[PDB]
Amino acid sequence: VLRRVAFVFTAMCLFPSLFMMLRRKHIAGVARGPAWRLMGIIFATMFFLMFTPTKWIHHFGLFAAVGGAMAALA
Amino acid sequence: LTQISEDAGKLQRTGYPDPNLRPAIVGVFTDLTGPAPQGLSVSAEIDTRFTTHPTALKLAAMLLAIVSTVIALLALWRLDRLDGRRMHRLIPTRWRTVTAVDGVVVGGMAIWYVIGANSSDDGYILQMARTAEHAGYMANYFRWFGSPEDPFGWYYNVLALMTKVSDASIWIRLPDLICALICWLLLSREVLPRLGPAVAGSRAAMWAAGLVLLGAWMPFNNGLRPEGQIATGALITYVLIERAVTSGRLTPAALAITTAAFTLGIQPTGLIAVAALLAGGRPILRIVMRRRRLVGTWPLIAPLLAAGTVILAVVFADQTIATVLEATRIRTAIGPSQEWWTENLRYYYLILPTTDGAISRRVAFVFTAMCLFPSLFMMLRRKHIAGVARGPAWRLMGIIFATMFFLMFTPTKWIHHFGLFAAVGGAMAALATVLVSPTVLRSARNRMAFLSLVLFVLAFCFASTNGWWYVSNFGAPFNNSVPKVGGVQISAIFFALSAIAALWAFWLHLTRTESRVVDRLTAAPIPVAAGFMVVVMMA
Amino acid sequence: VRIARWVATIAGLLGFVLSVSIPLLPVTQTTAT
Amino acid sequence: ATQEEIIAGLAEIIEEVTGIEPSEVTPEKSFVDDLDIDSLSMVEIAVQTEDKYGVKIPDEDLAGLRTVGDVVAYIQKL
Amino acid sequence: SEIPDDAVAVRVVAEDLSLSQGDWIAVTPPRVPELQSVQEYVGSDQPVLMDWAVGLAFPCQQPMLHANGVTEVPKFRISPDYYAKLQSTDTWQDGINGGLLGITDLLLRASVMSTYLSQDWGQDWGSLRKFDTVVEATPAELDFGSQTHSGLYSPGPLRIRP
Ligand SMILES: CC(C)=CCC/C(C)=C\CC/C(C)=C/CC/C(C)=C\CC/C(C)=C\CC/C(C)=C\CC/C(C)=C/CC/C(C)=C\CC/C(C)=C\CC/C(C)=C/COP(=O)(O)O[C@@H]1O[C@H](CO)[C@@H](O)[C@@H]1O
């Protein structure tokens, strides 16, 4: 041992939801915690991990699940 | 004649109908000699579509549009000067201090301007600027069929009229020194005291701002690739939107509109300007709503739309919209598509025309990921931090986070070229080194963990080779291999220092927070990290 | 007072329509055969 | 103007624009002799006092009056 | 500078102590060349086709400039080093995707001629190819006529693909 539909739509639903949860600071509808956990996962698997490091780019559509719940939260 | 072996109508006329097979005219070559016979002619109208110049009507409309938006911004400046605030005392008392950091930044951007490393495609932009006086249309010289770099490219005309004087490497490269001294003179005088009293009262904050400006400027913006001018564009539109936010006026906001419009035009990677424009959308709108009572809406937003579309008067100065569409599809067909730049940033470290991938990803993991994320987390976690003023800081954070999902890997497929936010990432790093300062982070654990992160990301930055592009690495300390000192690599010893700091943080997690050795070691880790990177590049 | 307010609107959006009409304007192409 | 309401509001705007917690703000502390503001950051708070209070501040008294008695003594003189 | 000043005679000495098929050498009698710098040989009047990687290191040689649809015919092809030329430069310009090399290899013969970086022998600065035409010819007369005015029409789609 020793990219136009799959990410940009997910960004266009991601950017409003973060600002809405930031400004309102608690929502009547959605529960508080695992919303922010789904934020944490999507917002961490978008960049520092897969964009800053650059570990084998362009496996485009791998937000099949969490992007779905993000569009639902949108 | 006719055909012998069907008649196929009533003539010998034959050929394909597809208008994608045409000759590549190089000349009209023959091998028969003598006087020319009658009835012999070969004629071809060459496709001089882009080589135009505007008529009297278009030139008159261009001049009327320019002078009309200058009149309407002067009328706007007379309109919003109705709160009786006069612009006395030019170059204010905030500016007339000279700090010791200017001897590191002005006298460090001149030694790097003379001896430093040019960018990858500096020859490309110099070569397509030296020939555009005789061609007359700013031709993308090399690749795309003689089609122009004019869907935007006004800036190369400045280099085109700048090659009238001698075109050595020290004189055509001067717009990346003047735009390196109106970045810093706007980074230490107009955006750090705007960012609060802590970032200006400290000296380590302005030091890490200067050193991160230097360390993010020196690999990328020093060439002829106009990414330094996008840095100065984003910084000018940010301070020109913030001045308008403070004093309540609107003509700095309209000048910020036209500057973000202009420095959208320099490069298609100039969307950091419109991101900086969009991030101040609510304060501009509330300024319009404040002045919406005394003066009506229609004389208020008409100079905004006037000074928003005058970028089209410099972009479309000598290119028709049909000509520009035929110039932009051409790159779209035969050009590198977004799936072509992805497997061309790792493979052999080949020189690519508008990209740096060794240094870009290695410049942008550190200097906007060890000073972007901790300052972001300490910003949105602690809702009321003592020194830092919220709103001028969140707008700059929005510029950085908007341009990471607006330009990079959406609309254009350039890989990370870190030279965009070399200016505004300096102020970003100043925010970071006042957000891990001992006056805001009481925990020695949470400081020592960040010092472990700093040492780890500095180890990752030293992981690859020490390799410059074409003739900048004619002679280097470590040209081919990883930089190693004392047999073992410097990457491994900074990994070991990261391990030592991480263990010292995990050991201080359980004891918990004295202030004897930790306060002297993690006081301002950003300027010492960025200064080590600057001095190793300079050395 | 109201003069500068008038000058901000007219020849402001005249500047807008002229600055948007610049691409759709005549140009004198130089053809070569 | 109940000498505490106005003061609290002006500290809420100092915190919003200057970014200083409502602790240093006393009459004993001021713009340039004790606290740290600047000539162009103080026009932001000047225009915010003109916003929430109908008090058209002259351009010479703004630079003239040095302390934080400037902001109180002018909203209580309509 | 390796051989001393009293050294008078040289003799090339070779060996092929590797018996596989891909291990062979060839020689040529030694020569002391007549070395001229590039700026002395290539002036500022003979138009060269600079490759895009090397434009800033060569800031004085006049590149081949195109005037209303035709170019000058180049005489040299100053290029970057071998790996960046083979994998990064001539794949950025050829007649497949626009390119400048599509109007040089169709018309001119390129032959590499020997260069050495001065005082740093052992580094590939690049390569300097000397074009020569296949048949002797003259630049065309090219009578041009202006004032084909336009609104927003294109005359027809450009040739981009077969
Ligand atoms: C309420 C109110 C009115 C205002 C208040 C709101 C406030 C405060 C702010 C909101 C904003 C605002 C105010 C607006 C008011 C004003 C307003 C109404 C709008 C203003 C908006 C702003 C801020 C700027 C406006 C910008 C405008 C109007 C024009 C900009 C110039 C351009 C780009 C025009 C586009 C031209 C057209 C029609 C098509 C061009 C196509 C295009 C742009 C991109 C496609 C072409 C491509 C893909 C090129 C890429 O090709 P490549 O493969 O990358 O090639 C590389 O190039 C290098 C070569 O060296 C190498 O790397 C490669 O070869």
Numbering used by the authors:
A (entry chain B): 488 to 489, 525 to 596
B (entry chain A): 164 to 168, 170 to 676, 678 to 704
C (entry chain A): 23 to 55
D (entry chain C): 3 to 80
E (entry chain A): 921 to 1082
Which passages does the manuscript contain on this structure?
In this study, we have determined the structures of a substrate unbound EmbB2-AcpM2 complex in a presumed resting state and a donor DPA-bound pre-catalytic conformation which we define as the “active” state. Relative to the DPA-bound protomer, the other EmbB protomer is translated by ~16 Å along the dimer interface, and in the plane of the membrane. This cavity is bordered by PL2 which contains the catalytically relevant D(285)D(286)x motif; PL5 which is organized as two short α-helices (α5 and α6) and a following loop region; and the mixed α/β subdomain of PDC. For instance, the phosphate group is coordinated in place by R495PL5, while the arabinose moiety forms hydrogen bonds with E313PL2 and Q431PL4 which themselves are further stabilized by N304PL2 and Y320PL2. The last seven prenyl groups of DPA extend to the other half of the hydrophobic groove via extensive hydrophobic interactions with I421TMH7, V438TMH8, I448TMH8, I468TMH9 and I469TMH9 in the membrane space, with the end of the tail interacting with F670TM14 from the other EmbB protomer. The DPA bound EmbB2-AcpM2 structure in this study represents an intermediate state before C1 of DPA reaches the optimal position for catalysis.
EmbB is observed as a dimer along with an acyl-carrier-protein (AcpM) associated with each protomer, thus forming a heterotetrameric EmbB2-AcpM2 complex. The EmbB protomers in the two states share common structural features which include two periplasmic domains (PDs) and 15 transmembrane helices (TMH) arranged into an approximately crescent-shaped bundle.
